[PDB]
Structures are given as C-alpha cells and as structure tokens.
Design a protein around this nucleic acid. Sequence first.
RNA 1: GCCACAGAGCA
DNA 2: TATTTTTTTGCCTTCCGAAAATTTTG
DNA 3: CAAAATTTTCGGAAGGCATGCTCTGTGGC
Lengths: 578, 99, 568, 83, 123, 95, 145, 199
Amino acid sequence: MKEVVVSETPKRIKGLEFSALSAADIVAQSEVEVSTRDLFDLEKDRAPKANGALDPKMGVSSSSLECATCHGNLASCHGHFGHLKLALPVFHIGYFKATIQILQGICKNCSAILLSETDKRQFLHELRRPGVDNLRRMGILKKILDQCKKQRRCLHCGALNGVVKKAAAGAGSAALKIIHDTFRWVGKKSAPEKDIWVGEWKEVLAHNPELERYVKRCMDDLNPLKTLNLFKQIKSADCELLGIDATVPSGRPETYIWRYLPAPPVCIRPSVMMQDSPASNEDDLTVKLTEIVWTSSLIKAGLDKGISINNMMEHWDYLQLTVAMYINSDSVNPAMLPGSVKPIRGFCQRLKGKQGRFRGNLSGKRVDFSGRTVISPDPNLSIDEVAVPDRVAKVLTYPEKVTRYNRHKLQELIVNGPNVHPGANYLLKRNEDARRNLRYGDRMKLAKNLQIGDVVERHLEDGDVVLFNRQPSLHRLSILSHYAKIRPWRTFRLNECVCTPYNADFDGDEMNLHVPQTEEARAEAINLMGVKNNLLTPKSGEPIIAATQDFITGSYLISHKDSFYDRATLTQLLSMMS
Amino acid sequence: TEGRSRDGGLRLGEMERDCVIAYGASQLLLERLMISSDAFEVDVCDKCGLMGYSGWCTTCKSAENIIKMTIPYAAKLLFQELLSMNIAPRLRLEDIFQQ
Amino acid sequence: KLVTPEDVMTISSLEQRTLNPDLFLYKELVKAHLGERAASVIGMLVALGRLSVRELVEKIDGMDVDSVKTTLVSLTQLRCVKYLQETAISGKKTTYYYYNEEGIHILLYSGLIIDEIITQMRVNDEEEHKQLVAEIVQNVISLGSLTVEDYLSSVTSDSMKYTISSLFVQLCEMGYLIQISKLHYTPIEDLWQFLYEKHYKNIPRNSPLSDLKKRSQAKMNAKTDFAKIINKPNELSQILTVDPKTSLRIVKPTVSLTINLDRFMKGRRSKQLINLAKTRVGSVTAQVYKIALRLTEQKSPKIRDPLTQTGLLQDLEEAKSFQDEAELVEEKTPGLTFNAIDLARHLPAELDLRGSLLSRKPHSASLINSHLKILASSNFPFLNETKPGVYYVPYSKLMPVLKSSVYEYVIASTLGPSAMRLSRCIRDNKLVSEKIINSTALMKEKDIRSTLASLIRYNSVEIQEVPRTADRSASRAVFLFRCKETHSYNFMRQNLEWNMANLLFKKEKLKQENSTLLKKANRDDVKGRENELLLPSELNQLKMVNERELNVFARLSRLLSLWEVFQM
Amino acid sequence: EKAIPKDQRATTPYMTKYERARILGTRALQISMNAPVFVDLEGETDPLRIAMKELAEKKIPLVIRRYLPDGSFEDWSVEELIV
Amino acid sequence: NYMSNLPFGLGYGDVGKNHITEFPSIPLPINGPITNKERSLAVKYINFGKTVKDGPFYTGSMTNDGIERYSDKYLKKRKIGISIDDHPYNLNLFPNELYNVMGINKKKLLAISKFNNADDVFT
Amino acid sequence: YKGEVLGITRFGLSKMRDSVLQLASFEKTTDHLFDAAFYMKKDAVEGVSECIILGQTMSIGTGSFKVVKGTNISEKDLVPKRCLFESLSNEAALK
Amino acid sequence: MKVLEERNAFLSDYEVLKFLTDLEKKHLWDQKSLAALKKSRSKGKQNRPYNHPELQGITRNVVNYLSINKNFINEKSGISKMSDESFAELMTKLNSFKLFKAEKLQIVNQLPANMVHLYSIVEECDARFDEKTIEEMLEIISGYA
Amino acid sequence: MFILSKIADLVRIPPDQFHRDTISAITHQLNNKFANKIIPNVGLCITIYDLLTVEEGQLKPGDGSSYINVTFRAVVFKPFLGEIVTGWISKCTAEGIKVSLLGIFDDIFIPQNMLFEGCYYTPEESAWIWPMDEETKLYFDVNEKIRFRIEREVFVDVKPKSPKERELEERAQLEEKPPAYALLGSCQTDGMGLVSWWE
RNA sequence: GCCACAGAGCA
DNA sequence: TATTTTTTTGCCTTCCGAAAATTTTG
DNA sequence: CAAAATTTTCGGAAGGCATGCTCTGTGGC
Ligand SMILES: [Mg+2]
Ligand SMILES: [Zn+2]
Ligand SMILES: [Zn+2]
Ligand SMILES: [Zn+2]
C-alpha cells in the first residue's frame, strides 16, 4: 500500500573518537539557554523557572513533572542539555596545561609555529609513519615543543619569543594565569623590542614613579581573551605538530577555551528531596551554574555600564575560579572566592576515587538477584552443591521461558504460588510489557492460559546453577559455581572440601550467592566455573579441592596399620560412605 | 542501592570481575554487569556519534541515522558527564555481521 | 521574545564562526568557481599542509587516484596548486602539492582585475577595444594560462587577429601579462632552501672561513641568485621576436602567458594611496598624485618582498638589511624619480591647475612643482625630496601610515569616533593609565571604561597588569593600557576574510536554493525574453535573487578594498 | 575470500572448554525459545540438560568459526571436533 | 553567599539576567546601495563565475533508463562537452605523474568563451 | 616487549596501553580523559575493560570465536526460476 | 537492505498471474480452497491456511486485477486461459514484426482488440507500419495465440 | 508493469522456526519485511520471487535466532514511463482526478495539465466534461473503467518530524501525508479516458 | 533524605 | 578580627630557576 | 682568546597515590 520498508541492522561499537565540543556543537545539542539566576519563581508554588538552571526543558528531577521536550517522566527521560554563554572567555582547567603547551610552540605576535620548514617536514614525516603509537607520538610532540622553545625569534616575523609559564604555580587565581617573559633570552644584543619597552616605561614612569619597583615583575600577561584571539589565527597546517587533528571543524585550539558552557541535564544532577517538604536541597553543580550565570551577568553589565577595570578583572578571575571549581573543586582553593568548608563535588570528583563512576559504577556495580548469608558446614552435600535457605530461595528467582518441554511444570509452579517454595513469584506474558504479581491474581486461570512464549519467574529449586563468592577475591577459585539444594536452616552450607579455595572457615564468615538470569550465563558458569572442573589451581596445577582437617585424620585412623574390621563393621562403613 | 536496610544489592567489584575474566566467561560477565544491574536502551546517531532521544538526534536534527542499542546506564551517565566537561566521546558503530 | 537554539543554529552564522577564515574563504571560492572535488582537495591541502597524491587519496573519502589526479590537473592549470618534486635518500621520487594564495586571489579579484585592465590602458575612448581586452583577459584568467597561437586559431579575420596580437603586445609591455614557468609553481621557501644549500656545498671544504662566515657567504650568493630568478619574469624576454613581415612587434607564438598578480596589487596600492591623499590635500593635487603614481607603477617595489617568506627574519641583521634594501630600491630605481616636466606631458585636457593656488593670504611646470611640494610637505609622507625638484614615493614609510589610517577609520565607522580618540590617545603615548587617559583625552570616565572594554574585544587595546603583591591579584594590581599594531592588524585581516567568506557562503546557499529557477532563466531561449516566457512570480523571484547577488558582489568588492591594505 | 578450505585447516581438532560452554549456552538458549530437539528426552525440562544430552551423542546443528588474528577464519563442525 | 559584593557602578536591578545575544549589531559602512560602476563590476564577477562554471576545468560534485523506445530517434543529444583531456596543456608546468590523465596524445581544442558586453542580469 | 623495562605502575601503563578508558579507570582519570580529548586519539573497543564499560562481549574466553548455524540449503535448490519473457524475446528482426 | 539492481528482468502479466496462482494453490488461498473447508465446514482442524494476511491480501488484489478484462465492450482477461505453449507461439509471432521489447510487453499485458488501443500502445504506427502489417498484428493478437 | 528486483537483505529466523524448511523460513521473513510495502526509489513489492544465494546463519551473542545474508529476486510493481494502464476512478477533485488499480495501488492522480483539452469540473454532478464535439455529453464518472498513460514517477522521503512537533500534532489531531510512491497519469492522446467511449 | 563521622564483622 | 601544635610513609614525575658546562662569536 | 649566548645538568617544590566486601548508630542542615 503506502508503508515504507524499514530495515534495522544490529550494530556494536567499533571505537570511540574523543574530542572537544565546539561552540556550534554545544549550542546545537542544547535545548534552552540558562539566562536566569533564580531557580524557582515564588509566585507559582516554587515551580521550576523558565530559562533557569532547573528548567523543565533540561529534564525532570521528580516523578510528578513532565519534561516538556520529550514529554516523559523521570523513568523514560534521557535528559537534555542546556547551554550558557559567558560574557568573557575563561580558561579550561582541564586544558590549561595543553593551552600553555600550545602557547609555548607558537609565536605570541603572529600565531605561527616556531619551527623551520625542514624540521616541520621531518617531524610531520615522523608523525605520519604507519606504526606510530601513543608513546612515539608523545615523544615526537615533546621534541617539537623543545625545538619550539629554543627558537629565540620567529621566522615569519622578527618578533622576540620568550618563555611562557604559569604566574605562580599554586592553588589560587594566580595558578590560572599565564605569563610570557619576553626578555629572558635577550641578553645584551640590543633587541628593538627592549627599546620600545624602556620607552613605554619611561613614558609612564613620569606620571607614576611608584611603579618603578614593580617594573621587574611586570610581564606580558596572556588573558583568556588575548589567548583566544591568538588561537583564532593559528594556521590549520600547524595544528598537527601541536597534537590537534585539523581535518574536522572541532579540531582547533580555540575549542579548548571556555566560550559556551554546556549546562548538564538535571537527570544527572537531581534535586535531592529532604524530610522537610517545602525545601529541596540542590546539587553543587546547579548552585555553581547559578553562580556562573550571576558572575557573567555582572561582567556583561559592567562592560555595558563601564565599571572600574580592577572590578572587571576581579570578576573575570572569579568567573574563572567558579568554572574551575565547577569542573575540578580540588584545583583551586575555595577560600579565595568572596563567598567562602567542605569542598563541592565537581565533575572530576564524580569520576575519580573508589566511589566514582569508573571504580564504583562501571568496573564494579551493585547487582540484582544476589544474597549474602553466614556459612556453616555440611559434609553430606556433594562438592558441587551448596545449600540455600528456603527463605532465600523464595526471593531469588529464575526467569524460565515456557516451552513445549516444561509447560506442565510451570503450570504447577504458578498454581503453587509465591508462598509454597516450589512455586513462582511473577509472570510476564508474551504480548505484555509489565510483569504481574502472583500474590494478587487468581493463580488458576493464569496457569490454564499459560502460552508458549511467556516468562515465569520461578523460585530457586534443586539443580539451579548459582555463583558462590567470598569477597576477598585473591585468585579465581574465590568465586565458583555450585548446584543449589534447598534446606530450611537459614544458612549457606558448602562441603568442607570446598572451603579451601574460598579461604573460608566457619567462625562467622559470610558469602554471596548470585543467580545468573540467562541460559548462556548459566551454561558458562556451570561449565567453566564449576567445582568439578576447577579441582586444580591454575597457579601450579596442584589440587586445591581435596581432603581438609578432620577428613585427613579420620582417613589416617581408618588406614592405620592396626585397624582390623569384621564383616559387620566393614559393611556398616561401606554403607556410611554411599 | 546499598545495604540490607535499603533492600540493596551485593557488589561485584573489580576483583570478582577479574576472576570472571580469568575464567573466560564473557556472557556471564555481560549478564552480571549489564543485564542484572543497569541495562538501558538508548538511541545512538551513526554520523555524529552522540546519543539521542525518542529516535531523534538533537545535533543533526534528523532521524535517519538513529540506531537502537543497549548500554549500561552508568556508561550513558559517564558520556553525559564528559559532554558537560567539554569532552565528546563520539561512538563509532559497525555491523555485527560481516556480510 | 526568547529565541531557541534551533533558531540560532538555523538563521544565524554560529556554525560558520568555528571555521578558520583562510580555509573557509579558499574552500568557498574554489567550490563557487570549480567543483566540490577541487574544494575538497584545496581544503585538505590547507588543513594538512603539503600532501602527496597517495595521501590525498587516503585522507579524502570517495576519491580514487584518477579522480585526485584529474582535479589536481584542473587546479594546477588555474594555478591554484603549487608542487615540488623531491627525491629521498633511498631514491624514491615524490611530488608534494601545496596551495598558493596567488590563484585563489586571482579567482577572488577576477572582476576587479578585468576592470583594472580595462581602465588602466586608456581604452575608454571607444568600444571595440573594450570588447577585445575584456574577452582576452577573461579567457586568460579563466583558462589559467594560454598561448597566443591557440587563441588566434579560433579567429578567422586577419584584421581581428592583428588587433588581438597588438593588444597582447600592449598587455605584455606594461607588465600585466607575464610568462608562466615552473617558478610560479614552486614554493619560495623551497627555492631559497635549494639555492642556499647549493651555495653552501660550493664553498670548499677545510676553508679558512668559520661556520658563520660560510653561512653569510652562502646567504649572499643565495640572495643574488634568488633576486635574479624572481626578476627573470619581468625582463620582457617573450616579446623580442619580430614578425616575418617588418615593422611589427609580436609576442612569441609558443610562449604561455599568464596574468600577473603583483602588478594588479601595485595598482590597488596606488588606488589606496590616491584615496588616502584625497582626504589630506585637495582634489587637483590628488589628480597630480594619481598621475604620478600611475606613471611610476610598473617599476614600483613589489607589495611583498619574497625574501621575507623564506624564514630569514629570525636574524635581526637580516631584518635591518631588508629594511635598508627596501629604502634603497624605492629611491634609486631609475624609473621612480620624476620631475614636473615629466608630469607635464601626461596631464589631461580637462585638468587646468590655473587658479588652484593662492600665493599670499596650462599645465605649466611651476604649478605642478607647487602641487608636488604641497604633497611632500604634508604630514603624511606622500612624497620625499632627494634633491630639490626631484620627487619619489616613500613606499617604506607611507604604507604603515595607510594601514593605521584605514584601521582607525574602520574603528571610527564601527565603534564610534570616541573609539578613534581612545585608540589614538593610547597610541600617542605608548603606555598609559586610566587617569592619564582621562586627563589627556577629555571625556567621561565611564565612557572611557566602556569604550576600552569594547576595544579590548578586537585586539585594539592590550591590558598590561603590573602586580603589587606576591600573588597577582586583580584588586591590588594596577592595569595600564598599550596598543600593539600587529595584533590588531592581524585580527582585523582575519575578520575581513571571515566576512568575505561568509558573504560568498550566503550567495552560494541562495543560488543552491533557487537553482531550478536560475537554470530555467539562464537557458538560451529564455534569456532576453524573461517577461514573455516566465510567470510573474518566477520573474519577481528572479528579480530578488539577482539583486541580492549583485549586492553580495558589491559588498565583496568593498571588503576587498578594505582588506588588501593589511595584506600589503 | 577469508574462508580457509577444509583441506588446509591448521588449528587443533579438539574442542576447547570455551567452545563447549558457548555451544551449550547457545543450544540451551535456542531450546528455551521452543526450538526442536533431536534427542529422546526422558522427561527433562531444563534446556541445559537437554543440550548436554544433545552434545553427548553429537546431535547439535552448529559450527565453530575460529578467527585467526590475521582475519581469516576456519569453520569446524561440532560433530567433527573431538571432545 | 557569593552574592553580596557588587561593583560601584552596577546595582542589584540591572544584574542577574545574562542575556548575551547571538546576533551582531555593529555594521560596516559597506552595506550601502549599489552604483553603476559597482553594478558593472558585479556583472563581471557573475560572467566570470559562469564562464568558469561551464569551462573544461570544473570537476563538479562527487531518466537514462535501460529501456529502449522508438522515441530515441528524433531525440537530439544533449551536448558534446569538452573534457579534461581536450585542452592544449603546457607539459612543462605539470608533474610527470599527471600525464596519464591529461591525454598527452589526443585532439586539442581551446575552449574560448565570448565576452557578454551588456549587463544581461535582469536588473 | 616495548623495548624497555616499563613497570606495573600508572607511568608504565601510560606507555604500554594506548587505550583511553582502561587507563582512565585505573588512575588519573581526569588527566587521561582531557589528554585524550586534546590529542583527539581514537580508542578502539578491543580490550576487556572498555568492553565491560560499554557492555558488550569481550574477545577472550568464549568470545574468541563465532557460532554459526549451518544452513542446509543446497546449491541445486537455489537455481534461478523461469523468466519466460526475457528469454523468448529477441530484437533480431530491428537491426 | 541494498538494491543490487533496480531492473533485473521484465515480467509479463502472464508470468506474474501464473506464479501467484501457483502460490495461492501452494498456500491454500484459492476461492475453491477457502470454500472447501475454511467456511461452512466443521472439519477445519489439522488443515490450516497460510497465516500471513498482508501477502494474501495483495496476492488476491493482484489476481483479481489481472483476472478481469481490461479491454472489452463493457469477462476474462485472456492471459488466465493462456498457457506456456500459447505464450511461446505469441513470442515467435511478435518477434518477426518490427517492434521493441516494451511494445511487445505492453501487447502481452493488455492484449488489445480495439484498434485505437493498438494505436495507443505503439507510437508512430503510421510512420512504421502499413495497413496490411497492422491488420496482421491485430489478427495475431485477436485470437490470444 | 511488474519487474524483478535483486535485493540483498539480512533475515532473522527465530529458533522456533527451525523445524520448517530454511527456504520457507527465509521466504516467510522476507514476506513479513517486504510484501505490500514500498521499497524506496524502486516501487511497491508484491511477493518474493526466488532466492539466489544464501549464506551461513550467523548468531548474535545473547540470542538464539539465526541471521542469514540472503540475496533474492522480488516482484515489484514499477510502471515504466510511457506504459498505459487501466484503472477505476475513485474520486474527482478540482485539481484533477484520482484513479485506483482495484485495491493494488490507490495513489494515481491525473492533473488538469495532462488531461483532455477543454475539460472542466462542475460540483453538482461531480465529473469532468470534455467538449470533444457536438455530442459532448461525456462524463468522467466515478467507479468507471478509465485508461491512462504514466508520465511521472514521483518519490518523496519518509522523513519523520521532530518529536515535540509530533506530540503537538497528535494532540491537535486528537482535539494527509505525501505518499512515498506516486504516479502521474496523462490523457494527451486519443484512446485514453473511458474504455467504453472508444468501443 | 543527603552528607560526613564513629564503631563492628571475615582473613 | 587580627598571640597560638602536629595528629603516615614512601615513591614518583613534571616543572623551573640556578648553576655548571659547552659552544659560539668578535 | 674571553665574552656571551646556548645547552645540559642538578637540586627542590609540587601534586598523586596507597585491600576487599559487609553491618549498625549518631549528628546536623
Ligand atoms: Mg573466618
Ligand atoms: Zn526529556
Ligand atoms: Zn611570528
Ligand atoms: Zn547526530
């Protein structure tokens, strides 16, 4: 008729291309411009304010509001970005060292790289070899920077280039300043720039002699605006020698200077509800965003109405420090700000440490369908068997898909219900999206209407594959796979021949029990992580699951040379082991 | 969540992940760390690499290159946090089947 | 009301603000005149520097070796790509392709070049030479370089062929058409490096001279050989051939002629100097200066010394040598000095000079001398006196004045006359404070602060922070202001390049949007009969589109008049 | 063009433990989605044990595509591999 | 608090908004009405762009059905356009690796355009 | 194996491994991420750590091979079907 | 989804009609098949039609369109009664004439009996064929071969 | 009218269809994906004609379904330029007349420019009048057999709008789209129009 | 509820 | 407002004057 | 040859980093 053929191809991730967002990329992905300090309006029962730091268009932080961009609740919203335009550019604290390295390799008068064409071609040829890795690339770039530092005068112009460094190298605003000592290599060769410098200071010292003591420390400072305008006229052919790929529009040095700040979605900085209803605590990122809006508005109004230049530069430095704390709170001292103490949790603080994203939510994370219980011995269990409490087995469930081979069993489990242990807790129909609790339904019509593709979450029964883990995981045998048996005594029970790989003893030890929820994971666990298939440690190939104490002694007393048994005792012992 | 007082779950830390790596069980690791914790269906644009919403890329302003994928929610949170840090982790996608 | 980021990304130029003006301008010009393949090649060469054919293939997706070779041929014929063939130590020979601003500027200045050619040779009297000069120059620029025999093969009239040959000779005599060679395709830096290495090897080994003496001798030999090679185009070696019939001078048939950009930029500099002189000394004296500059234009110094692009300015002595050499050539060139008697023959009939001067409160020599003495005694160094009665244009001392005047008046037109006052105040005494500005320049302090805050955004005023504490806090430090010329000039040159490129981008977008109607209107039967063969709505759309395109090109010309001063 | 022919196969003819685990997982996942089985199952309901019985007498329709590091692969029938 | 300290010139009412426009407001004086000389210069620009657009060196962007009808005859061919290898190249100005694609031994035609005297732009 | 003795440290792994997410998850997360953004390096998803981070199958253990279900379609079953019009029609009599 | 070639071969209406009737017979979609057990008969169990409704609908519409007479005074289209031998005979007869592939395909698809219809299918009939050849072609198409 | 298109595709056979023949399962999946649907820049697909090459079924880690790269010829409805065809008039407008090919494809529109010269539309009888001669009582009545000639095959994109622009449009609708395939008929020759007229 | 702090369990 | 303590240890690289060493001019 | 520019060496300061999981109670906005 009129429908168009739709083609969906499964895809994976081939790689990542790290870069920096330009101004156009920041604005393009934005949905609202944050241009208001006030978070809420008091005239509308403390609703989120339009064009603010908590604008609804950026997402929702509660479960009752709507996004007004995708029209979804808190569960179904991916969050949307905003953007914020600074009145004046400021330095990026993350790219500050990179900015200094770029400035050390370019002429501070014409933005040309301080390299002869022969050295330029040789270094490009070294960089463009097929087998270049990261270490060789960093070495070549360091050699390029060292050669640029040795260039006393530029090549396209006759300008004298000194040394570019930090102002003080500390933890304040002076740590976010770049100074250019132009006359450090001048010596006594009578450079024409020195004549202009001494003429300038002779002219200005006739009016303010008091500055004479401060002439020595006076150097050509590189404010973010001058650095940005210097970066804007860097030739793209020289970007490869500074480490930047110029084939894409985002590969320019001016991308690494803050002009547009992407305001993050409120789904990643949610307002935390407290026990008090009228007041809701806000994340540090939102407060810092409001402070950035306030300072940028102050700077813009000062530019329009002509405030004093000292106040302008002070508020520029305060904006730089505020954005630096917004990125990395440990980079600068909070005491330097006029408002200021517990340091805020910046973006760098959310990514580093054991409690960050990488080591707390990406490499390792909380998992479902797991239980933790004290262990006690059980020699009557097989070595590939662990005894799970009946109470734990009624919570930990396995989703079994109804087939032609297991329809009657799952019908019986649905009839039994969530309370009787050989039973089920949830049922998910083939054409439905929300699983239905079996604690409220009829439990007899559901069993009769059990289709051929439904998924029933049955209780953990005998023979279920469970991962058994002791938390101080030193070697791979510290987590194994066992078959579940169900026992009523509220403790995990494993055979004492198996407690040696776990380094576990029954004096208060607790272990963890994971239940794989996929057939592939279940098979991989039972075939590669089983107790039977892991009787030898991979350290040396020697057995690790074998006789332990109170089993070696009994075996020695049986096999002792003066142990003679009649047929009754022999037969009793043989029935005892089987 | 964390702790039995909040009905929390147990942590499969770096050491246990590394033990499972030493066993060679890829599907078990994928089930434990993605399926059972934070699986999330997301829209990925094939041209600009950035993620989208509702089958729509806000950067390219088109729905032609949107691809449904499944990632851990921590990865999406990390990508948004990096985008707030002026870092663009543009994903590059390829077909699973060589064809 | 509020504007969405969608509207900002759609109707504004935010996406184009993140592009380098050089790359954006060159790619837009090449995409407008040539195709998108040549635009991709030029953009990749600008982004990555010199590249090979294999590298261009492996860097651009969707182009193979034959396509890259074809578009490189197309760019090389129009002189948009320079090349250098170099041999490795292992014996492999590789050709590396560059980009030259000469061909792209030829594309950018094309109509201005045609107008300058038409106006300069005084063919304003009648019509047929207007047609022939325009068509030959348009063909030369469009085809890059053409031979005279191949041009004349398409003409069947003998008298027309004779007039075309005479016009080609007239163009070649006055320097506008030169002989194309491999010099125009090799880079200046590579040529100087080759000459310097050659003259370094020719120095005998175990010489009594030290390393610096060897370098100085090699530099001197390289400089004289480089000067000979550079000036070899301008020796009129392609015109010495006489035709088999006597009394006729002809250009050589098999020689390939090309348009000379340096002569056109000399003409543009002369026009800029005439416009500058029109604001200081009268209108009749402006006419005398105009005639003097048109007379001494072909032999005038070049706009940019090629030796300055060889990387030789890292030595201060080389910089002083270049400045002294420029001051010498602008004065002691035989064709640059002139008298009143020399200008007496070149005055037009309309020019009178009779009652233009009052001594106390017919093209005679004394009146011309008085006008030239007014020019020489002005504050701007329009002319200088070597010996009394002989005048020459001081191109070394006049052009920074022109740059500063153009820059200050652009700031006056954009940010206001108070911005001119503040900029010139900070310039006159080099390093100043806010109170010294307020005392010296009599205007309100808040106006001073707002004006300098506006000027800082355009690299006009640089803040010098003098710290008075251990940590350079802004509250305790004192902020002085200085005016650096080079930063501001480079910034405004980049700004004008970006504006030109954005204008061309808008024009190309408009044409791509109305392509169907423009293709319908430009058809052979449709043209000349647009009223009869087109609907009124399509006619009105064509009206608006053509008016917008003409306005785009007029603004482009006005920008070019404002941008070439900073390229001097 | 990357397929090594059957005559020139150079990898080991023995089934690794990882191949066994992946084959069992794939067959169990297929059986859990109502795929037909080729064994006389004696009241078994778990897909994993049915897959184990299928591998016991080599009645499983899958092949292993072993990818060499260069890019060429190598197709081995499961019934051909020795376990 | 971070909100207490204000500069002397500013007040509380005029701060806290942060509305920086994305649209410029400082125009150059070059945006005036066009003149006759500028009109002739603009039509020269247009003519040159058109004559390079259809020339032998264009290298453009990077219903001819296979069905055969009797209408193919009485239907004229579009244009025998000049190609990249139909130009009298000066081989001394080109690298040796480009000789393969220029057709060094082929027919040589010089595509010479005719100047349009009148400003044929429809106002 | 890189020509020198690196050592199992932050500095050693910063030279051995060219992957970004693996180094970021170990130590100096922000410095490594910002260096990767500045130098614009491409990180191929081939290592175990970033495969875990992005949630896809790793290339070691059970992911070193691909399971393929052998289709039972013979070549004889895939012969082209009858196309009568294009076979019986000829243009020998134009031309 | 990629299209290797837009046009691989030309299909006449007879080929499509025969293929779709064979498909309907294979999937038990004919009117006789549905009249047998699908409606008004109790024993519809253990014998079921092909479930796909979209393909059944489109094949029913196409067989209804190609079954009825497009060229008539107002019941069959003629291609329904045509067989492989008649098709081969019509190919042999029309190949001797001064016609193209498209014209022959349209003649097969529509089977003109009206004279002006045969004027409409082939263009410049007067400039290519005389009255005798036109009458011969009309006689060939008249009997449906 | 009907042509054969060679298309390469990736079919997903669920594991519950493994009992069926592989050709039948692949054809069933291809008929789910392609039958009675518009292939862009190609036309309207009717039925999968045959399969040419079948590759080995690859399995995604985490799913038991088999993905097969299959090349197939499919019967697609593409009336070429200049081909004439007979349809039934469904509805007539002021701009032109709409004709359907008996449920196969109801998206054929004949405009005024390519219609019979002198035709005019008057609302009271809902038909177009062609003054051919003195006996001009000829009407383009609905539900009648017309013959026309295909002159243009137009394709438009199926590009979706912005999400917010989609919920607002849906909300407005709760309180017509360009078809991706369409053909433009013509009546510039004798013999077109009603088939009964040229009896 | 968020945030730190404090103690405790197992090698 | 201005008196005023530390509360692990070991290792590591990058930066940066300062100083020693070497090269290079005049 | 000794002044003078340049390159390399050698210290001291500045950041970065340091087992796993688990369980309670108390306090403050
Ligand atoms: Mg213990
Ligand atoms: Zn949303
Ligand atoms: Zn410089
Ligand atoms: Zn996108």
